[PDB]
Amino acid sequence: LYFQGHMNLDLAYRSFVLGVAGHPQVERLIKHRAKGLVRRYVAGETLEEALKAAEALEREGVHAILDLLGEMVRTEEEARAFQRGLLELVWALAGKPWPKYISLKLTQLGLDLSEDLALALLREVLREAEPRGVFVRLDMEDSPRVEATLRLYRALREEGFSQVGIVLQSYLYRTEKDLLDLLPYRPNLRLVKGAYREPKEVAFPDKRLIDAEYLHLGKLALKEGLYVAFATHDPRIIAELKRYTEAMGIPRSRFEFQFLYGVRPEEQRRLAREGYTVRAYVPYGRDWYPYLTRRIAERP
Amino acid sequence: LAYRSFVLGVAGHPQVERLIKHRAKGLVRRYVAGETLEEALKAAEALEREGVHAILDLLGEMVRTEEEARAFQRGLLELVWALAGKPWPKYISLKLTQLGLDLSEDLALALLREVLREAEPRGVFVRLDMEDSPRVEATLRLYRALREEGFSQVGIVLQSYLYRTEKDLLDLLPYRPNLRLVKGAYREPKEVAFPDKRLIDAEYLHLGKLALKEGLYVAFATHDPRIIAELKRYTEAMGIPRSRFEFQFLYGVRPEEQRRLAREGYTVRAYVPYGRDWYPYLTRRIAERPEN
Numbered sequence: 001l002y003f004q005g006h007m008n009l010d011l012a013y014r015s016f017v018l019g020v021a022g023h024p025q026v027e028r029l030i031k032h033r034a035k036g037l038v039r040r041y042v043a044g045e046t047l048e049e050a051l052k053a054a055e056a057l058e059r060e061g062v063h064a065i066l067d068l069l070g071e072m073v074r075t076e077e078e079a080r081a082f083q084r085g086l087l088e089l090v091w092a093l094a095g096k097p098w099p100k101y102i103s104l105k106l107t108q109l110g111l112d113l114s115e116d117l118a119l120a121l122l123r124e125v126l127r128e129a130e131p132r133g134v135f136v137r138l139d140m141e142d143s144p145r146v147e148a149t150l151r152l153y154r155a156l157r158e159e160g161f162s163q164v165g166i167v168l169q170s171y172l173y174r175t176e177k178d179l180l181d182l183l184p185y186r187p188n189l190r191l192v193k194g195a196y197r198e199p200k201e202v203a204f205p206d207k208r209l210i211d212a213e214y215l216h217l218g219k220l221a222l223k224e225g226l227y228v229a230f231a232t233h234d235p236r237i238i239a240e241l242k243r244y245t246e247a248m249g250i251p252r253s254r255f256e257f258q259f260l261y262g263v264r265p266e267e268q269r270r271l272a273r274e275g276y277t278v279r280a281y282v283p284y285g286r287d288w289y290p291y292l293t294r295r296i297a298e299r300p
Numbered sequence: 301l302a303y304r305s306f307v308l309g310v311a312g313h314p315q316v317e318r319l320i321k322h323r324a325k326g327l328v329r330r331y332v333a334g335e336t337l338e339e340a341l342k343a344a345e346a347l348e349r350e351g352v353h354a355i356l357d358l359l360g361e362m363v364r365t366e367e368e369a370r371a372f373q374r375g376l377l378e379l380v381w382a383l384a385g386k387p388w389p390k391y392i393s394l395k396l397t398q399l400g401l402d403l404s405e406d407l408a409l410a411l412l413r414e415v416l417r418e419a420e421p422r423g424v425f426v427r428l429d430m431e432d433s434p435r436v437e438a439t440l441r442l443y444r445a446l447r448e449e450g451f452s453q454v455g456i457v458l459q460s461y462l463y464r465t466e467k468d469l470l471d472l473l474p475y476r477p478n479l480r481l482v483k484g485a486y487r488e489p490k491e492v493a494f495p496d497k498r499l500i501d502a503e504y505l506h507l508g509k510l511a512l513k514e515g516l517y518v519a520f521a522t523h524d525p526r527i528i529a530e531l532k533r534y535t536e537a538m539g540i541p542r543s544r545f546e547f548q549f550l551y552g553v554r555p556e557e558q559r560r561l562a563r564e565g566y567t568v569r570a571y572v573p574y575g576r577d578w579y580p581y582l583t584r585r586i587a588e589r590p591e592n
């Protein structure tokens with residue numbers, strides 16, 4: 001792939017990262033000599049490590065979002081196996097004296113195979129989560145999956161569930177309209193810039209416009225009285241949202257900041273000491289290596 | 301910016317001013333209509349022939365006394381009376397400080413009220429240009445007061461670089477203000493205004509979209525092509541009709557974009573200065589952009 005005359009840099013980087021990570025020797029090397037580096041960003045392979053990591057965050061004033069990692073689901077059986085992993089997490093979280101928050105992808109409950117299946121399995125998760133006070137975030141995947149995600153979110157809201165939330169991505173042209181459409185749902189929103197490679201036709205290609213849209217949507221959601229989680233590490237955006245919420249007298253109980261586990265941990269702590277609700281998004285499970293490969297292959 | 305320093309530093313010399321006035325008349329006329337009202341109306345006619353509208357802006361020396369304030373008001377009344385019966389849309393801009401705002405709010409209000417009384421029956425729209433931050437509160441006071449007295453053909457300008465602007469906008473919604481949105485022209489401290497240009501631009505887009513979703517008429521007064529492209533995309537995608545917003549440019553600045561937007565069916569206006577004290581304004585047009 002070339003892009004308008006010259007090599008596709010984004011593709012070249014991605015393909016190199018992937019090619020180097022997939023090399024058997026590099027994978028052996030990283031699992032052996034880079035364990036200190038990995039556990040900084042990944043709790044461990046088990047639910048027990050993940051719960052330990054959450055207790056360590058809590059000790060420091062920071063809350064945990066637990067995100068089970070799994071190889072990509074391609075069969076109904078694998079979606080059911082993944083759901084079992086999610087149920088185990090919900091049950092284990094049940095006792096805990098702290099905020100209980102999990103994140104999942106609908107594709108890992110078989111969305112691409114059957115939307116009916118995904119909804120079925122998700123409702124069973126929500127049935128266990130809701131009475132235990134476990135909050136469930138539906139992570140937003142790529143643009144072809146947005147309509148189904150909002151559809152399943154609305155369906156569950158309408159069946160009586162409230163311990164469920166959505167993620168909206170500021171890089172999409174469609175997001176402002178999705179926000180305004182969802183207003184009657186009073187949704188609990190995580191606002192992100194967005195993680196995927198999206199074409200010019202559906203997403204702002206300009207990083208200035210992505211960041212500008214983030215602030216616009218964040219401010220719109222706040223003025224609407226929505227609870228909003230600002231999931232971002234951007235210090236310009238964080239500083240503006242702190243200035244804005246303070247100037248508008250938005251209570252600290254109506255918004256929060258969310259960081260990936262291990263990313264700007266001094267900031268997570270600092271925001272918490274300032275009275276903000278801060279969460280770290282904590283991946284765990286046996287599929288951490290492909291997962292971290294992909295987060296590295298996103299951008300140089 | 302070395303370019304900006306040079307031009308600004310050479311512009312003040314009396315022999316530079318004389319050379320521009322005699323040998324760069326084409327340069328002057330690009331950015332200012334002329335010294336007289338008559339030249340200003342000719343410039344508005346020329347814009348109209350190309351689908352572009354005019355905002356007429358009387359320039360005068362800085363007002364310092366009540367007598368100067370009244371002299372300036374008389375200039376504006378002459379403009380209002382001259383616009384009467386012109387076939388095309390009639391829009392004038394003014395600074396409240398030129399109506400004696402720093403002298404008394406009462407004076408500026410009395411003078412402005414007389415302008416709006418002559419203006420409204422003649423179909424002349426009056427924009428209150430926004431000045432620097434110590435003047436915003438008084439400006440909104442005069443606006444609101446005049447609205448409550450029953451005037452409607454009067455608009456305000458809000459500047460995206462100020463922290464206070466979103467609250468002003470929200471506070472003003474019951475008035476259904478006719479709005480010109482600008483980035484802002486003054487040097488303002490970090491305590492009052494975004495220091496970062498990325499933030500000023502983000503806030504411009506945010507306020508504009510907020511204003512449009514509230515159903516307010518908004519004039520986007522900006523030359524920024526990133527912002528124009530985005531507002532064009534957004535208004536299309538959201539089905540906002542072309543009769544609910546417009547684009548405004550300084551006279552002589554991106555004149556091909558002005559015509560292009562007019563051709564694409566957008567409402568476009570050029571802000572046309574005229575009057576005796578045009579040399580300082582023109583200096584700022586040359587300085588602000590490497591030119592030639």
Ligand SMILES: Cc1cc2nc3c(=O)[nH]c(=O)nc-3n(C[C@H](O)[C@H](O)[C@H](O)COP(=O)(O)OP(=O)(O)OC[C@H]3O[C@@H](n4cnc5c(N)ncnc54)[C@H](O)[C@@H]3O)c2cc1C
Nearest residue numbers: 139140167192193194195231232233234258259260263281
């Ligand atoms: C808790 C959480 C949940 C998310 N959920 C989703 C989801 O469901 N769907 C989705 O598409 N995306 C999701 N995202 C990702 C988001 O879309 C972005 O891709 C990611 O957060 C990086 O963007 P950013 O806002 O940090 O700013 P970027 O534009 O990536 O970075 C700009 C500035 O942020 C700071 N920064 C960014 N990364 C780092 C770093 N690794 N170390 C130090 N500083 C950094 C730097 O100062 C940089 O200059 C989530 C992100 C988080 C943190």
Ligand SMILES: Cc1cc2nc3c(=O)[nH]c(=O)nc-3n(C[C@H](O)[C@H](O)[C@H](O)COP(=O)(O)OP(=O)(O)OC[C@H]3O[C@@H](n4cnc5c(N)ncnc54)[C@H](O)[C@@H]3O)c2cc1C
Nearest residue numbers: 429430457482483484485521522523524525548549550571
């Ligand atoms: C009709 C009108 C009315 C205004 N009224 C007020 C007011 O009442 N109060 C007030 O404080 N300010 C007012 N302003 C000014 C405004 O606040 C800005 O200072 C001024 O418009 C410059 O900012 P900008 O958005 O054009 O873009 P800038 O941020 O100056 O420029 C951004 C981009 O725009 C493009 N650009 C700018 N100029 C040119 C050019 N000459 N040629 C090609 N590209 C260019 C460049 O690509 C640049 O990178 C008004 C401006 C206009 C046009």
